[PDB]
Coordinates of C-alpha atoms in Angstrom, one line a residue:
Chain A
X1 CA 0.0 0.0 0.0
X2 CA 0.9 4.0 -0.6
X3 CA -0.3 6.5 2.4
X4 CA -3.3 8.0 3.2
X5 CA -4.4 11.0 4.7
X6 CA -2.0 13.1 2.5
X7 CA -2.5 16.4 0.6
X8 CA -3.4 16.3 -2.8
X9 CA -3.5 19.2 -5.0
X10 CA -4.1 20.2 -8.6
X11 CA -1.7 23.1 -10.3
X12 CA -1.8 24.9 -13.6
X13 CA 0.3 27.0 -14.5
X14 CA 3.8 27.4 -16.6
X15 CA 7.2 26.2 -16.3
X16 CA 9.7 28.2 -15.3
X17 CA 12.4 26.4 -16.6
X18 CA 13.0 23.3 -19.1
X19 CA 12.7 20.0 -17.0
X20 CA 15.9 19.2 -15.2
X21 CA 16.4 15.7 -15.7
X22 CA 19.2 13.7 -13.8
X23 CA 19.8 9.7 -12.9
X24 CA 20.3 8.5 -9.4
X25 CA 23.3 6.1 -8.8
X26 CA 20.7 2.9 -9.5
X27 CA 19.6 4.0 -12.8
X28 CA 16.1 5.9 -12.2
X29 CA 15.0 8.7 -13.4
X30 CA 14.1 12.0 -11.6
X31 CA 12.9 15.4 -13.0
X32 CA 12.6 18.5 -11.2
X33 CA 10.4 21.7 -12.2
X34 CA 8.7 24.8 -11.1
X35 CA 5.1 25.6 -12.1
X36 CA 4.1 29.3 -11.9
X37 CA 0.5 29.8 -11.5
X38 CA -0.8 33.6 -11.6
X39 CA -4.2 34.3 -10.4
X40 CA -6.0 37.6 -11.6
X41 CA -5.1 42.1 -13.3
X42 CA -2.6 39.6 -12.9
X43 CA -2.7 38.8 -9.2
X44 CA 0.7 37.5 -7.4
X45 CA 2.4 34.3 -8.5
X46 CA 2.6 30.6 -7.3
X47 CA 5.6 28.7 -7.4
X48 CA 5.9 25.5 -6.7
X49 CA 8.7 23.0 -7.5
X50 CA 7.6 19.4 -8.6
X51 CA 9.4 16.2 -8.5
X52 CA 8.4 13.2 -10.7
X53 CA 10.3 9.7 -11.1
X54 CA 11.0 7.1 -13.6
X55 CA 9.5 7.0 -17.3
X56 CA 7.5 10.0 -16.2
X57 CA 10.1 11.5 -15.6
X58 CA 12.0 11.0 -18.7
X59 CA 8.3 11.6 -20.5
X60 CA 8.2 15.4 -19.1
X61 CA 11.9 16.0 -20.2
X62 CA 11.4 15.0 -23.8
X63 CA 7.7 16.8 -24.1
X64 CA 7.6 19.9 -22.0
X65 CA 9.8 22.7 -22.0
X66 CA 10.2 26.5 -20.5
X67 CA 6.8 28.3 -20.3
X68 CA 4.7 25.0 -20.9
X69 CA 1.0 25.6 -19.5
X70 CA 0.8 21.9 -17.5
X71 CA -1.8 20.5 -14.9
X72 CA -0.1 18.9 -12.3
X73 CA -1.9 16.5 -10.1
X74 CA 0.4 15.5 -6.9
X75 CA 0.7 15.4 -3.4
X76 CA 2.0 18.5 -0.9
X77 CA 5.5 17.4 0.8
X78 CA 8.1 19.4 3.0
X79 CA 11.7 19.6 2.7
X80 CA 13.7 20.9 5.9
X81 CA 16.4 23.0 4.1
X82 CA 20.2 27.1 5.5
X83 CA 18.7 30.0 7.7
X84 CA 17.6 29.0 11.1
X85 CA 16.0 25.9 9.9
X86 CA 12.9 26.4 7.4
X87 CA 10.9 24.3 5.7
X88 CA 9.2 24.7 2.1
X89 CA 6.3 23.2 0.4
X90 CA 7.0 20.9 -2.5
X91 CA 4.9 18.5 -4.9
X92 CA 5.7 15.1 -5.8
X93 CA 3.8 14.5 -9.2
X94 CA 1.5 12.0 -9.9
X95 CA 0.2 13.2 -13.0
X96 CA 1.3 15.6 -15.6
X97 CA 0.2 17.0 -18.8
X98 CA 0.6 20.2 -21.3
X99 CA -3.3 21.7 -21.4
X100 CA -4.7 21.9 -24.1
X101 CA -6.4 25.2 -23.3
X102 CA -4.0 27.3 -26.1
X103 CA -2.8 24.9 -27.3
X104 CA -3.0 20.8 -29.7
X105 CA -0.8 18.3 -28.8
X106 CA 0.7 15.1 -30.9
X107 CA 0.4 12.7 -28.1
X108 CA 2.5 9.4 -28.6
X109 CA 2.7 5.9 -26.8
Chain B
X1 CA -18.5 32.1 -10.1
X2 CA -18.2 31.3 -6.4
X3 CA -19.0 28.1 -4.8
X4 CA -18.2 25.6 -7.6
X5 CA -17.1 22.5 -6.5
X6 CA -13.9 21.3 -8.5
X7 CA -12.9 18.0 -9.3
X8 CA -9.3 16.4 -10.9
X9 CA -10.0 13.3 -12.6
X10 CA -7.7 10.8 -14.2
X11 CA -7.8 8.4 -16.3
X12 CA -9.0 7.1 -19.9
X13 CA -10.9 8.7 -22.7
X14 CA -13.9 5.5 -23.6
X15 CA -14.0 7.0 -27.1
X16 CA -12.5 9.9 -29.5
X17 CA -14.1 13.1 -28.1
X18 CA -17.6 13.7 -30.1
X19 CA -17.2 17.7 -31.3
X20 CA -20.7 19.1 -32.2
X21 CA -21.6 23.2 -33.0
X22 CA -24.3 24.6 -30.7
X23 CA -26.9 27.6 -32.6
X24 CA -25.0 30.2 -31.5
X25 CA -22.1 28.6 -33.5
X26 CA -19.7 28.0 -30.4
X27 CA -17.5 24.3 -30.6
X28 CA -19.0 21.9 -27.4
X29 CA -17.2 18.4 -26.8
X30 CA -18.3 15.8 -25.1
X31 CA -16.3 12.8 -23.7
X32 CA -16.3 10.1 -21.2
X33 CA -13.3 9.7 -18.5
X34 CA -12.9 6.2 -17.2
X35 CA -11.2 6.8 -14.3
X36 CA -9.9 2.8 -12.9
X37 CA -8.1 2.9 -9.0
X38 CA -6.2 0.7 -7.7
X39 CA -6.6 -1.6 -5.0
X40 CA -4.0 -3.2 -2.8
X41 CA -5.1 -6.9 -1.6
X42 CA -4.1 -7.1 2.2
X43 CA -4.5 -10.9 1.3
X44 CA -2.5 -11.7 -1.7
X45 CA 0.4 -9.0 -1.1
X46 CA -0.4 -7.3 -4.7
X47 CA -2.2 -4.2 -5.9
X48 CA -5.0 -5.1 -8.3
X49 CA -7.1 -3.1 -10.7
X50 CA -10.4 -1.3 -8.6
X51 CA -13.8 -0.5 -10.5
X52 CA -13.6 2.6 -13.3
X53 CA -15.4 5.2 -12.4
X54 CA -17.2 6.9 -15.4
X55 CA -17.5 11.1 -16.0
X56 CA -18.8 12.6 -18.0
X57 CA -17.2 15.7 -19.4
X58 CA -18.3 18.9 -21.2
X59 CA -16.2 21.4 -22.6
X60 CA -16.5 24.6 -24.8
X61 CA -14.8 26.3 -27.7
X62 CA -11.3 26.1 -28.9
X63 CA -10.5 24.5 -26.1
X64 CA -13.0 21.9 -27.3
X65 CA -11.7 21.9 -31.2
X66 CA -8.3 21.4 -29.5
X67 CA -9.6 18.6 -27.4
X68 CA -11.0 17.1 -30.7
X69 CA -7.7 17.2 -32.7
X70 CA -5.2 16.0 -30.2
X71 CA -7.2 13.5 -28.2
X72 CA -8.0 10.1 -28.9
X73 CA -10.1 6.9 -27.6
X74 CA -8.3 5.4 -24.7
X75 CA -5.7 8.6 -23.9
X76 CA -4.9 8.9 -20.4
X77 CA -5.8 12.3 -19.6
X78 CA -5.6 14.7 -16.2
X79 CA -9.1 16.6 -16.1
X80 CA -9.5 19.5 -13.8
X81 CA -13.0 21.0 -13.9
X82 CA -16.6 21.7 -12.1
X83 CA -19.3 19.1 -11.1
X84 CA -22.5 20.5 -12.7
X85 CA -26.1 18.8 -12.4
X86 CA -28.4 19.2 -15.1
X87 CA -31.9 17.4 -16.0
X88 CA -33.3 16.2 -19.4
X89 CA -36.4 15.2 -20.6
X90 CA -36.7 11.1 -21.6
X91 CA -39.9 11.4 -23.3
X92 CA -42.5 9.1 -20.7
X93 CA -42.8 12.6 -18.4
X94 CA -39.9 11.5 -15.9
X95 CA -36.7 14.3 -16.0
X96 CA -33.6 12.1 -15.5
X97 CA -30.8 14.5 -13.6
X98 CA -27.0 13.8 -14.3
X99 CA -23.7 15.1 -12.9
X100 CA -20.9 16.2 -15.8
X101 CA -18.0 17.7 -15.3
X102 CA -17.5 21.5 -17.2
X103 CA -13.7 20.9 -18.0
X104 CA -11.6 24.3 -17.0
X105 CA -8.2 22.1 -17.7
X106 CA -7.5 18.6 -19.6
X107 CA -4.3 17.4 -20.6
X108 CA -2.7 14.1 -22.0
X109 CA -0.6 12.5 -19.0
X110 CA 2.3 11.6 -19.6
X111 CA 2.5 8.6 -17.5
X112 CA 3.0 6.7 -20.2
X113 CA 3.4 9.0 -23.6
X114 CA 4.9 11.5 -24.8
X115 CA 3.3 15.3 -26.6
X116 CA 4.6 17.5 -28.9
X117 CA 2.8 20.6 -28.0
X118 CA 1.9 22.7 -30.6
X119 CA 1.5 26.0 -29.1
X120 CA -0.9 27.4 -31.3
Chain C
X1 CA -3.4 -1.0 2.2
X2 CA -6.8 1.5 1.1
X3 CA -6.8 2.3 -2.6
X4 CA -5.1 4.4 -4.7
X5 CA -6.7 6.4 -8.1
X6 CA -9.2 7.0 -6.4
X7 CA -11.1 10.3 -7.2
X8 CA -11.6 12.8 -4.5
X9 CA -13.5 16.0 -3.7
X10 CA -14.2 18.5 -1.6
X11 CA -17.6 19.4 -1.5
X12 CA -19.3 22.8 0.9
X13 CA -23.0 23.1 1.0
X14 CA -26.1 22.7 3.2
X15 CA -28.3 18.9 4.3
X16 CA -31.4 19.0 2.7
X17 CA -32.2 16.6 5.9
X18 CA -31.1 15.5 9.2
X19 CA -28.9 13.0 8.6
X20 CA -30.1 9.8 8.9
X21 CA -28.5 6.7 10.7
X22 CA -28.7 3.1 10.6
X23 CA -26.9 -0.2 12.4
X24 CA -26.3 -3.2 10.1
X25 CA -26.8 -6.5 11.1
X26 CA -23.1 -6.7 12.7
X27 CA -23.8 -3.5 14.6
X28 CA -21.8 -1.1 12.8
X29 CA -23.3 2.3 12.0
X30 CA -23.6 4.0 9.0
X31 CA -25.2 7.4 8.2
X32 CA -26.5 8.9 4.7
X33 CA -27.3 12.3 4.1
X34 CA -26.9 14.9 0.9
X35 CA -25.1 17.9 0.1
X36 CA -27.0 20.5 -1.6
X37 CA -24.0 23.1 -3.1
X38 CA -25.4 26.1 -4.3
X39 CA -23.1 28.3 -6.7
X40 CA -23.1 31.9 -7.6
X41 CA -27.3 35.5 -8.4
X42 CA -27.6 31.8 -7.0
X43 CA -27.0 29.4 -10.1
X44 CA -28.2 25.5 -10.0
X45 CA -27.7 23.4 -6.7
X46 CA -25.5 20.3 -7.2
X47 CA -27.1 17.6 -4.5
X48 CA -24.6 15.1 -3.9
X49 CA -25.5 12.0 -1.7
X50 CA -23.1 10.8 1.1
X51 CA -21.8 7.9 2.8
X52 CA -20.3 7.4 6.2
X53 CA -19.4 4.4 8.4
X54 CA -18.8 3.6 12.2
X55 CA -18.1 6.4 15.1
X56 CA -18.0 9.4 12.4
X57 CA -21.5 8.2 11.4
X58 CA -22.3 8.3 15.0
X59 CA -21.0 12.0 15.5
X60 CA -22.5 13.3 12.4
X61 CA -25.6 11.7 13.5
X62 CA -25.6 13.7 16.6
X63 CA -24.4 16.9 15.2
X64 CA -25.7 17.9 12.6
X65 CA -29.4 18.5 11.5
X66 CA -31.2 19.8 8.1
X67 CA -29.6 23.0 6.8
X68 CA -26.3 22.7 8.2
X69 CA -23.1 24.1 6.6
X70 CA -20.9 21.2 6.2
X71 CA -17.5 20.7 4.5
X72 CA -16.8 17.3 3.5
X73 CA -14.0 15.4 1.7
X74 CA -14.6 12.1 0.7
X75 CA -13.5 10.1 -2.5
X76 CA -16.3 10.1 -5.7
X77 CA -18.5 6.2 -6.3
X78 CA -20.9 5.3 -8.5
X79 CA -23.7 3.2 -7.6
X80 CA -25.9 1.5 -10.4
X81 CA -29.6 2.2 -10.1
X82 CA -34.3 1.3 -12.2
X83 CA -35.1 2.8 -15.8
X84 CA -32.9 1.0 -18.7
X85 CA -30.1 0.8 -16.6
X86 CA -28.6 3.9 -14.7
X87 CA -25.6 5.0 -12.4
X88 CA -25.5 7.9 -10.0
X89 CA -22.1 9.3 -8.6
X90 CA -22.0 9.6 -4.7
X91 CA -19.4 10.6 -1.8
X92 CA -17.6 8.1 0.7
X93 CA -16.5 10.7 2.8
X94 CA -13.4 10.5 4.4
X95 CA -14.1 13.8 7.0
X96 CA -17.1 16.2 7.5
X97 CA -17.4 19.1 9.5
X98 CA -19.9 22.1 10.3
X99 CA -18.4 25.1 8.5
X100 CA -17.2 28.0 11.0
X101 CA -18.2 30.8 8.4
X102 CA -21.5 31.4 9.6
X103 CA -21.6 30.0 12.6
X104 CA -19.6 29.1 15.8
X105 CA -19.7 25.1 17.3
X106 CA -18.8 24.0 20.7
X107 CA -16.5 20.8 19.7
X108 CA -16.3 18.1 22.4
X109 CA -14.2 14.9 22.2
Chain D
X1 CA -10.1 35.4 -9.0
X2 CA -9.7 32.9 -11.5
X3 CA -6.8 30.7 -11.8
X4 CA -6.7 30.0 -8.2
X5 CA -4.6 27.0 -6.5
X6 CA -7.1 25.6 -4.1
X7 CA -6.5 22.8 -1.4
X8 CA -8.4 20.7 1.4
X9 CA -6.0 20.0 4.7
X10 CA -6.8 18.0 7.7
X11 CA -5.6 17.6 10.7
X12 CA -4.4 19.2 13.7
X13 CA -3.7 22.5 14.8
X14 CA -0.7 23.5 16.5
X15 CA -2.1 25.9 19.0
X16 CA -5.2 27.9 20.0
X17 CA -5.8 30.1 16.9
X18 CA -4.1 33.6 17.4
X19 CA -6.4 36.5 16.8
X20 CA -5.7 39.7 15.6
X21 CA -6.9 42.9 14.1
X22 CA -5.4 45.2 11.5
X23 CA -5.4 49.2 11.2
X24 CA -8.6 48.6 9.1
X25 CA -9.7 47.3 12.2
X26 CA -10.2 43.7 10.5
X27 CA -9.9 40.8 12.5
X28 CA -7.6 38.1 11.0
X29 CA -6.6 34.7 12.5
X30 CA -3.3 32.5 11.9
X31 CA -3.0 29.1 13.0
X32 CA -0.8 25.9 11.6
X33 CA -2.8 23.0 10.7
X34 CA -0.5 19.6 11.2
X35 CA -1.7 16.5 8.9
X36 CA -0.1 13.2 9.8
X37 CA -0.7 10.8 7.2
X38 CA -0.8 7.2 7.1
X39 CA 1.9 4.5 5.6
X40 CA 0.9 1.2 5.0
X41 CA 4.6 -1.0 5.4
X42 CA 4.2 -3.9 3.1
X43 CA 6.8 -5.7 5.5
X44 CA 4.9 -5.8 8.7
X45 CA 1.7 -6.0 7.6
X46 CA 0.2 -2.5 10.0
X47 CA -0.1 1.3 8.9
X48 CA 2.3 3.4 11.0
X49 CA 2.0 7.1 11.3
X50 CA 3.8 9.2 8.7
X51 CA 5.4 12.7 8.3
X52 CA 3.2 15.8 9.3
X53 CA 2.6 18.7 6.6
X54 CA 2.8 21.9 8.5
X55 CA 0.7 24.5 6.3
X56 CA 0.3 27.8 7.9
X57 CA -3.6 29.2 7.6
X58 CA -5.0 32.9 7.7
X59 CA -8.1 33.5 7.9
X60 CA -10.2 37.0 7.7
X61 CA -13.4 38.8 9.9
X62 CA -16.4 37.1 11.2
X63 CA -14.7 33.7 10.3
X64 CA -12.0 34.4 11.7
X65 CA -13.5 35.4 15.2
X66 CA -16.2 31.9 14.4
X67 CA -12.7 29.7 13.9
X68 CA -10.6 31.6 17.4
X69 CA -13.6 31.1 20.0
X70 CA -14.6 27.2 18.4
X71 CA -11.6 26.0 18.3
X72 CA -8.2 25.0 20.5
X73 CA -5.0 23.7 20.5
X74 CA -5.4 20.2 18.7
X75 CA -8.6 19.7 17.5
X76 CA -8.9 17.9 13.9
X77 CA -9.8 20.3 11.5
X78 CA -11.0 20.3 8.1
X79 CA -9.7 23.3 5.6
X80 CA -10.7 24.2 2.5
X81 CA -8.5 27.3 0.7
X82 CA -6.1 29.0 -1.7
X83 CA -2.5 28.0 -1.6
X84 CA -0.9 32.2 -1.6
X85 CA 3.0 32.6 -1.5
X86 CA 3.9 35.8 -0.1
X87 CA 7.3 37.4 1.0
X88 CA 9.1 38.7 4.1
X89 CA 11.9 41.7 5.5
X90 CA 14.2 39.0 7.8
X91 CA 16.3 41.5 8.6
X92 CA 19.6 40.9 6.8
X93 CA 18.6 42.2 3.9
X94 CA 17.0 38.6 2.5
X95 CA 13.0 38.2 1.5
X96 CA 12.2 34.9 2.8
X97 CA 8.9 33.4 0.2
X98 CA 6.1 31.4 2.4
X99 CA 3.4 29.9 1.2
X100 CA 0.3 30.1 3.5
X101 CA -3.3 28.8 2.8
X102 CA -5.9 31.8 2.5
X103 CA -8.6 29.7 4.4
X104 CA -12.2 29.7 2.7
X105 CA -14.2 27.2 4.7
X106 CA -12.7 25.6 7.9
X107 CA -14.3 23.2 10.2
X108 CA -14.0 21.0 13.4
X109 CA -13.9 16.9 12.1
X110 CA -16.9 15.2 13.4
X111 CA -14.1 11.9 13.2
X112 CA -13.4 11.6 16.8
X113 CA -15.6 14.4 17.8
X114 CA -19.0 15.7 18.1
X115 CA -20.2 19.6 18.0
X116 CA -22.8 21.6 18.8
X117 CA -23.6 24.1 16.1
X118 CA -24.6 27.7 17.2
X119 CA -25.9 28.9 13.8
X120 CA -25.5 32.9 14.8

């Protein structure tokens, strides 16, 4: 079994940056992001930095790159990082697709 | 609006996404997501396949031509939109009410695919 | 282990009815009500039917009555009804609470 | 708005809600609402307890008042609200980023608890 009781959430927004892919020492994938979502004017922006494993992984880095509108369907997690001692919000992915709001897509496998 | 309740939704399209043109001339799709969970068996020590939810989905415009170009029977998509009752006639007197989801977001996962993203 | 894919929402509205409760034949309770959500002028209510089990069932039973504000998160199932063949989509809830927007609650337990 | 990032968190809080009022004279309540989750280990056979998520919640006028005389220290909560990042002095010349949930509907679990609603 996975957990329970954790926190879900849906994001839309736009990447910041092109994935970042990298391997571990065993041979899996990881990719790392940012999705900026604005509100609205244009209200303040949302950033949060995703995490995503395996073929998913290597998925995003081939499809998406720098200012891709994506939903993002994941679960809230905390990493402890360098001042005092703080702690920030990330999102490990689940899902992830472009939208297809603004724009088509070619979708493959 | 305020006061919509919003639902993510994944899982498979049943069928290519049926694109119709209402009076006013405005694109309208229509598709079914057959969303199937997972169940682990405390039992057997292995996850097996739960019982598919199915949604209905509505969405509008060129979101909907784009919907209708790029999606296909049995893509995996992520669906972010509103639950929304409405009621229709069936003829003997008796309104049947459904829930559909009004699609704000859908995307192709890519779980397992990959998109070129034309960015129109 | 639970499940996992699993759809879930987060519904706010008012019972249309007290809820009501039951005991099956192995003495476990279980309580059903429905969760009228009204958007906004008003626009059309959504009136979702809900399922809870056991001591929750219990508490809800005792707590709330018709008209209540209530947030509730449950996971999305579809039960198979009675004219060709029909399904209707209802809510295992997971938690439920009387919303504090409108109204204060003495909480015991 | 539009465009919002929206969440539902349960759990615990931290502390009594703090209550306070701005020059507008707009009362406006902070709190820390702790969810434990749940991990299933495959090994032993029994869910254990896993990691809190800490999310810090503000919540505005009569709700807020509603929220800081119902509830205390460690009761289960159920939050519905808008994931906001905002930034901070710290000093040393550094903006520190937080991201706090802007609460729109909060209310005590009924899991392990009963309440008595006053309706105002």
């Amino acid at each position: 079994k996975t957990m329970a009781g954790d926190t879900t959430i849906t994001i839309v927004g736009n990447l910041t940056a092109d994935p970042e892919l990298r391997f571990t020492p065993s041979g899996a994938a990881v990719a790392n992001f940012t999705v900026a979502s604005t509100p609205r004017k244009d209200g303040e922006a949302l950033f949060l930095r995703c995490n995503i494993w395996r073929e998913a992984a290597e998925n995003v880095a081939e499809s998406l790159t720098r200012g891709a509108r994506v939903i993002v369907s994941g679960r809230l997690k905390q990493r402890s990082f360098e001042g005092e001692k703080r702690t920030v919000i990330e999102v490990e992915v689940d899902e992830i697709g472009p939208s297809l709001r603004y724009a088509t897509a070619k979708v493959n496998k």
